Amino acid sequence: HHHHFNLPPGNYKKPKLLYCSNGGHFLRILPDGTVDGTRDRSDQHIQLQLSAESVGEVYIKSTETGQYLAMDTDGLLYGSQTPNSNCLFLERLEENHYNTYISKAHAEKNWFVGLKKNGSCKRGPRTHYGQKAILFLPLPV
């Protein structure tokens, strides 16, 4: 493609929690389709199942509700009931350590999945390489 191909180690067999180093929040997909982050590890909407379409391309689904993480045309994250092209993310390693997710549908603009220090999701255009907001650490459930 038009991006590097350094991939993170690990597999997709088990669901995971995506911990964002920015404010220490776990990515969360609420039932109402809202996406944000919470520090509460017992939350039932932070358990995410990642699966790969093609190598380096993944879907991120909440095991609790079955919703797929998706980014709209204006760069906002939301939970989609069905796995369409806007639910695909390029899963890449960053700084030889973290996981980052670029919206495939908007990869030319580098719109990343990201969380602010206050736990609210960042809007695509507002994300950039170099921010802690886009840096995630996957933890097995």
CATH number at 69 reads 2.80.10.50
Distant-in-sequence, close-in-space partners of 3: CB < 8 Å, separation ≥ 6: 90, 92, 102, 107
The Cα-based distances of 16 to 11, 58, 64, 73, 132 in angstroms read: 10, 13, 12, 27, 20
The answer to whether 6 is annotated as binding is no
- Rounded CA gap, 27 and 32, in Å? 15
Range of the domain at 88: 1-141
122 CB burial (10 A radius; 0-12, 13-18, 19+): buried
- Rounded CA gap, 119 and 36, in Å? 6
Resolution of this structure in Å: 2.1
- Rounded CA gap, 103 and 95, in Å? 19
Number of domains in the chain: 1
Beta bridge partners of 85: none
Between strands 136-140 and 68-71, the pairing is unpaired
